[PDB]
PDB file of C-alpha atoms and ligand atoms in Angstrom:
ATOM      1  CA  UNK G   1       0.989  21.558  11.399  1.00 37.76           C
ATOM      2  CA  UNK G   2      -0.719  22.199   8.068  1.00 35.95           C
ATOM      3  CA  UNK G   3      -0.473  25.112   6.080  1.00 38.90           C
ATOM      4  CA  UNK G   4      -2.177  28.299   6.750  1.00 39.16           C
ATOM      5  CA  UNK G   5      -5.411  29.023   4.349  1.00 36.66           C
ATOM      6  CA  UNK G   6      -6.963  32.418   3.958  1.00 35.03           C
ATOM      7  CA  UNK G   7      -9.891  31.416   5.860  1.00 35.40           C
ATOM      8  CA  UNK G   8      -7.401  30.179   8.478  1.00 33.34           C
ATOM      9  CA  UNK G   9      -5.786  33.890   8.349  1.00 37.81           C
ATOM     10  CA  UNK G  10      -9.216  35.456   9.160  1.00 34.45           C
ATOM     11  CA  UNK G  11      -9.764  33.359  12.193  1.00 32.55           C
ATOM     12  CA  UNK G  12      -5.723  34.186  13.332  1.00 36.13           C
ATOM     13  CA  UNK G  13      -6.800  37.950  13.145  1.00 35.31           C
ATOM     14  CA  UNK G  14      -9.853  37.743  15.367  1.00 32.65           C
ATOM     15  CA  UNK G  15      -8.002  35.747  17.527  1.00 35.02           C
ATOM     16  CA  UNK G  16      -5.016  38.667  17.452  1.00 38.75           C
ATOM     17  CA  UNK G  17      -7.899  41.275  17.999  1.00 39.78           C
ATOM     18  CA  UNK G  18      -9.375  39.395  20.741  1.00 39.66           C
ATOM     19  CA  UNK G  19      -5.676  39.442  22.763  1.00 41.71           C
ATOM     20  CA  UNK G  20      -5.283  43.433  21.645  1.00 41.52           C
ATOM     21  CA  UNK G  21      -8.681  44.300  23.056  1.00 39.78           C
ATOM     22  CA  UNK G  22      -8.125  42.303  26.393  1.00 37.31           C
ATOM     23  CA  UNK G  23      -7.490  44.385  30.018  1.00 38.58           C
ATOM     24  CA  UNK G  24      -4.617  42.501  30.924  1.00 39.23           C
ATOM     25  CA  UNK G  25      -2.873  43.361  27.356  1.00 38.96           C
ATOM     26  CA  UNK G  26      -1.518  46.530  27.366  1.00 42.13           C
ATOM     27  CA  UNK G  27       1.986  45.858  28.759  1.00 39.08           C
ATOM     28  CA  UNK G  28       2.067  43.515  25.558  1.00 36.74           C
ATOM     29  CA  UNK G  29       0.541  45.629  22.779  1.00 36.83           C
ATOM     30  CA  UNK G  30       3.564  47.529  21.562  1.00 38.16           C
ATOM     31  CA  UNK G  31       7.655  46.532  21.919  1.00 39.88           C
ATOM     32  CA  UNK G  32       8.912  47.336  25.271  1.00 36.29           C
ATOM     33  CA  UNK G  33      10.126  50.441  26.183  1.00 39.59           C
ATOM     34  CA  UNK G  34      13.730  50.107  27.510  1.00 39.95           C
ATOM     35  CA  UNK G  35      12.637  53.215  29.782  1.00 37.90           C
ATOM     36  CA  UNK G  36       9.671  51.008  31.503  1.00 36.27           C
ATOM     37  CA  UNK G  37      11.924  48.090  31.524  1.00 36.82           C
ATOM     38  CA  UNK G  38      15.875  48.020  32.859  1.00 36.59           C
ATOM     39  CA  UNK G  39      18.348  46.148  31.362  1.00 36.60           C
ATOM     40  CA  UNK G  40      15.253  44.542  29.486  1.00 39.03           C
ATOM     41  CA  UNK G  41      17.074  43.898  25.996  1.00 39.56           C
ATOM     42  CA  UNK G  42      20.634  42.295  27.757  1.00 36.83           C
ATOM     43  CA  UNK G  43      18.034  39.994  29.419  1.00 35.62           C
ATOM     44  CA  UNK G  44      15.925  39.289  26.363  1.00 37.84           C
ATOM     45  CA  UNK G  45      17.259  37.481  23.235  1.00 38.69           C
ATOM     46  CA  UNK G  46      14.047  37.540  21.754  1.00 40.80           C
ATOM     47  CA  UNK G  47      11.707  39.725  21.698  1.00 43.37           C
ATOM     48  CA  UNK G  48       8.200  39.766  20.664  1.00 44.17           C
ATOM     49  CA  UNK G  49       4.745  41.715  21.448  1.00 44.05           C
ATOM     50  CA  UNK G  50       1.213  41.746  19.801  1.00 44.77           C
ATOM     51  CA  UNK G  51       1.849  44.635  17.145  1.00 44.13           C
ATOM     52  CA  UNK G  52       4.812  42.615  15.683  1.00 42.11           C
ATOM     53  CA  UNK G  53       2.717  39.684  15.585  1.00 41.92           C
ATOM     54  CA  UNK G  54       0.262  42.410  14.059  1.00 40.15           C
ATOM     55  CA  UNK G  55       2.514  43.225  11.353  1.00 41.85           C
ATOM     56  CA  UNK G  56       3.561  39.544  10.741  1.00 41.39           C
ATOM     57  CA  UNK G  57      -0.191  38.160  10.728  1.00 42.92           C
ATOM     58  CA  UNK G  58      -0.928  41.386   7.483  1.00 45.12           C
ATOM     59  CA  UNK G  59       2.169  40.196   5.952  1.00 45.63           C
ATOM     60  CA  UNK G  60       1.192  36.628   5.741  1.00 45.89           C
ATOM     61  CA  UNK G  61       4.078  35.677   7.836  1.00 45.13           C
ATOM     62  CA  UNK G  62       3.062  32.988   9.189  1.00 47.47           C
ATOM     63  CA  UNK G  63       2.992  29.894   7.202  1.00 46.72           C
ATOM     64  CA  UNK G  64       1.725  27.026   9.647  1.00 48.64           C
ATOM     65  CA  UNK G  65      -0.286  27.830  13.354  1.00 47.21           C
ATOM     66  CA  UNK G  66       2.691  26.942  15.050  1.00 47.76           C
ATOM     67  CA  UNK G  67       4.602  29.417  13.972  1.00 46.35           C
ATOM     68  CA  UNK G  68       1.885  32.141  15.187  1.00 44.92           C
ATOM     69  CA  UNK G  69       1.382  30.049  18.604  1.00 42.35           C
ATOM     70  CA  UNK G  70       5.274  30.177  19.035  1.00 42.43           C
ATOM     71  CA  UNK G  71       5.466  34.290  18.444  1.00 42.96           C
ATOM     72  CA  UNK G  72       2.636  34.277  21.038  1.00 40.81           C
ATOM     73  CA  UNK G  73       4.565  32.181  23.430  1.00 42.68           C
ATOM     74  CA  UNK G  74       7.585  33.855  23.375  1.00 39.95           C
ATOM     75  CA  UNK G  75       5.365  36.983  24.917  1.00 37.46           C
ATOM     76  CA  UNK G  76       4.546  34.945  27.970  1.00 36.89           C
ATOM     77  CA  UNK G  77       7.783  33.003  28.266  1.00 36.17           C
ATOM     78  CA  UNK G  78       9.792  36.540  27.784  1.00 39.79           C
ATOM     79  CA  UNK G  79       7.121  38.406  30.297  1.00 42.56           C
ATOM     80  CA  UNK G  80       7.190  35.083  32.798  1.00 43.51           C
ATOM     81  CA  UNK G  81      11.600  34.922  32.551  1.00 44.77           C
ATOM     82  CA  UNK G  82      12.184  39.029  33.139  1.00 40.01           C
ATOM     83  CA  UNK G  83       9.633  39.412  36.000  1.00 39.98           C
ATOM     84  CA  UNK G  84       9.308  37.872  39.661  1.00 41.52           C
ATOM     85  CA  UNK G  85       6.248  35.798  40.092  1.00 38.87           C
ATOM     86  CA  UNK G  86       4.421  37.807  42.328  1.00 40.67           C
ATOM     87  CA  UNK G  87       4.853  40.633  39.653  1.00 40.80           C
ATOM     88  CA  UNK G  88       1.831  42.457  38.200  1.00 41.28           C
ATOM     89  CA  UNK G  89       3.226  42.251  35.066  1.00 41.89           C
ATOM     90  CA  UNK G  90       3.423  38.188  35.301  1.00 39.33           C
ATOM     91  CA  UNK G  91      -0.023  37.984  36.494  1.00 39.45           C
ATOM     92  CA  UNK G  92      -1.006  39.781  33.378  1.00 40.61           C
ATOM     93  CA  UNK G  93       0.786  37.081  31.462  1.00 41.80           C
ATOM     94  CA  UNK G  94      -0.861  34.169  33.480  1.00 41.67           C
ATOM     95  CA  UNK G  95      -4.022  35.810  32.411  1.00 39.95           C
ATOM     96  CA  UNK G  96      -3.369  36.524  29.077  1.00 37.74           C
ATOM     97  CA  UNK G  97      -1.694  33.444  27.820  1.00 39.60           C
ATOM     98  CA  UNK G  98      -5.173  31.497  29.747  1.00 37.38           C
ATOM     99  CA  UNK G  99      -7.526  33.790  27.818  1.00 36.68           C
ATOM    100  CA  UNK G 100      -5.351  32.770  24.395  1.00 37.64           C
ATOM    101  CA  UNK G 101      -6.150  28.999  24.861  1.00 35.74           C
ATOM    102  CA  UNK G 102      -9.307  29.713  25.322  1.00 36.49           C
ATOM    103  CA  UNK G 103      -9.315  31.483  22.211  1.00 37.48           C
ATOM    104  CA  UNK G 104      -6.915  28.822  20.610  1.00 36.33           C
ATOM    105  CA  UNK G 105      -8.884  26.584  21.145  1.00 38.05           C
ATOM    106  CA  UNK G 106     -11.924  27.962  19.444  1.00 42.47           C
ATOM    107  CA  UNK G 107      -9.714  28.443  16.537  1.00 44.64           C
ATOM    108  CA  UNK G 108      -8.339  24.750  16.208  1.00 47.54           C
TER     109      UNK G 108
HETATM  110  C1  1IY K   1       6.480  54.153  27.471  1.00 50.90           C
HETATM  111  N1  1IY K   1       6.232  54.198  28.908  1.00 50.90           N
HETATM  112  C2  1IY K   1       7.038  55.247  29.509  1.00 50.90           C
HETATM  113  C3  1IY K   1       4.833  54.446  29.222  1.00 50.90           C
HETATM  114  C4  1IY K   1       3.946  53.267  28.840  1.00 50.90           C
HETATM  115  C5  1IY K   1       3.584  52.348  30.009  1.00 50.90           C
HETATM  116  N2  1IY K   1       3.780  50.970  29.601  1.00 50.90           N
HETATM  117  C6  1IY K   1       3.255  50.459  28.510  1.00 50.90           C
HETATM  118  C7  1IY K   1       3.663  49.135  28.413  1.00 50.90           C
HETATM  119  C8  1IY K   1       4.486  48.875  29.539  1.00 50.90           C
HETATM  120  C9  1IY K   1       5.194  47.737  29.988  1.00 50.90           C
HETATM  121  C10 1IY K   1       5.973  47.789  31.140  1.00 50.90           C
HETATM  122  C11 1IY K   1       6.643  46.487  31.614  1.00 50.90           C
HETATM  123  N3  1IY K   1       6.382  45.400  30.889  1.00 50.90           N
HETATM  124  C12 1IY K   1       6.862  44.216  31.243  1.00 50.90           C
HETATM  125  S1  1IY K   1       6.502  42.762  30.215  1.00 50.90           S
HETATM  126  C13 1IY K   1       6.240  43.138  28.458  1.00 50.90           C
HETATM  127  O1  1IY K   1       7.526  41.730  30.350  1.00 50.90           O
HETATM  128  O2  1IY K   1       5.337  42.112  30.802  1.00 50.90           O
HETATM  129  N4  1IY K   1       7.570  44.021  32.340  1.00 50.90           N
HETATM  130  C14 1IY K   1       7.877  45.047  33.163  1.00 50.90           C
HETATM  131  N5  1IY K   1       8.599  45.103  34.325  1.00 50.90           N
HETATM  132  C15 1IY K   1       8.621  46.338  34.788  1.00 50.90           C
HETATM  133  C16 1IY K   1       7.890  47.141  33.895  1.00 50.90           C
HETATM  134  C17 1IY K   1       7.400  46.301  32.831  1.00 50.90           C
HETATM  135  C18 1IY K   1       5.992  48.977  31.874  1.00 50.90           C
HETATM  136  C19 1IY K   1       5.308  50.095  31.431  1.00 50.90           C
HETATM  137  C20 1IY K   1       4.536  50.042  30.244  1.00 50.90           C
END
């Protein structure tokens, strides 16, 4: 996909915002915390939550949108692979990960 402008940036941090501010976020907004989460780091190869992507998106890390779409998908697919279906915590991710298309989509 085709390289990231500065306009393009803006839109990727309301679209960031947007996922911060939502209900359903909160067990995403920060790296887990081994205590909330057992054995969550043997089970986990990768990582990822909304204030790396945070860090990443001020850094100008991302180069093309399917690099940021990726870092965003590896927060459902991690939250969807450690937690049982009928989990709270992977209903927050099927609601989540529904609102960002939404907002994806907006963005292009
Ligand atoms: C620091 N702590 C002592 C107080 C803060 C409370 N708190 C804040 C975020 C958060 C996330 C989980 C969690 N997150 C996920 S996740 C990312 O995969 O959806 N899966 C899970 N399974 C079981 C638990 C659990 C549990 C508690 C949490």
């Amino acid at each position: 996909l085709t390289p990231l402008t500065e306009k393009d940036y803006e839109g990727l941090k309301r679209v960031l915002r947007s996922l911060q501010a939502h209900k359903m976020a909160w067990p995403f907004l920060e790296p887990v915390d081994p205590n909330d989460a057992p054995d969550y780091y043997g089970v986990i190869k990768e990582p990822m939550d909304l204030a790396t992507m945070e860090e990443r998106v001020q850094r100008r890390y991302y180069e093309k949108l399917t690099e940021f779409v990726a870092d965003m998908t590896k927060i459902f697919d991690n939250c969807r692979y450690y937690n049982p279906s009928d989990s709270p915590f992977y209903q927050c991710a099927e609601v989540l990960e529904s609102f960002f298309v939404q907002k994806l989509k907006g963005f292009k």
